[PDB]
Amino acid sequence: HHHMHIRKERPQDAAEIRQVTEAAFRPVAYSNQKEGEIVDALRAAKALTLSLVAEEDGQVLGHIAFSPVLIGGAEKGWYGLGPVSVLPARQGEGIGGKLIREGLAQLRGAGARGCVLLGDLGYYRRFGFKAYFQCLAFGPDMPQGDVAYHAAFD
Numbered sequence: 677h678h679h680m681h682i683r684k685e686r687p688q689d690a691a692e693i694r695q696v697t698e699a700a701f702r703p704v705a706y707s708n709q710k711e712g713e714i715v716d717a718l719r720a721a722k723a724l725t726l727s728l729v730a731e732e733d734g735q736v737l738g739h740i741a742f743s744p745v746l747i748g749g750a751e752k753g754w755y756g757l758g759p760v761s762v763l764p765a766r767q768g769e770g771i772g773g774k775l776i777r778e779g780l781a782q783l784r785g786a787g788a789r790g791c792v793l794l795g796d797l798g799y800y801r802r803f804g805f806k807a808y809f810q811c812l813a814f815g816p817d818m819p820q821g822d823v824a825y826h827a828a829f830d
């Protein structure tokens with residue numbers, strides 16, 4: 677019962693998810709510390725498409741959010757990945773990678789057409805993202821058009 681496992685969030689997790697998110701982003705120099713707010717706003721708007729936690733000994737160690745993105749104003753089965761957050765002390769152990777791979781697998785399994793993200797130049801290549809935006813297509817390549825994240829992201 678000391679094993680880490682990944683599962684979908686439940687309503688009872690909201691405070692802890694936000695605590696982990698805010699801890700992860702607190703020292704991030706370009707962060708305006710809105711990532712916790714964003715997750716909660718996505719949830720409030722029913723736009724938190726997928727929300728997974730990594731849990732061990734009843735504690736949330738990490739979290740990932742996915743939400744729909746519009747392309748040229750249209751819903752085309754594309755999602756944005758983020759935020760993803762792991763407790764600072766438990767980073768560099770593969771938790772983030774496990775959350776990302778599992779989240780992508782669940783999106784694909786539910787009929788998604790692709791995922792986009794903004795982030796580190798090289799890290800996300802291990803999940804198939806290719807290069808602003810990085811993109812992972814589950815079928816045809818990403819259709820052209822302005823990418824808009826949900827209003828929660830501002």
Ligand SMILES: CC(=O)SCCNC(=O)CCNC(=O)[C@H](O)C(C)(C)COP(=O)(O)OP(=O)(O)OC[C@H]1O[C@@H](n2cnc3c(N)ncnc32)[C@H](O)[C@@H]1OP(=O)(O)O
Nearest residue numbers: 700758759760761762767768769770771772773793795799
């Ligand atoms: C799209 C977005 O959401 S961008 C915003 C991302 N989130 C943040 O910036 C918040 C602060 N940062 C974090 O919370 C974390 O650093 C995250 C979520 C980005 C990554 O979570 P982690 O659990 O540390 O991810 P993970 O362990 O899979 O990989 C991190 C690095 O540790 C390395 N690593 C992990 N496990 C091992 C291991 N057993 N041996 C050697 N290296 C390892 C990884 O290769 C990676 O380094 P690399 O990019 O040079 O290859």
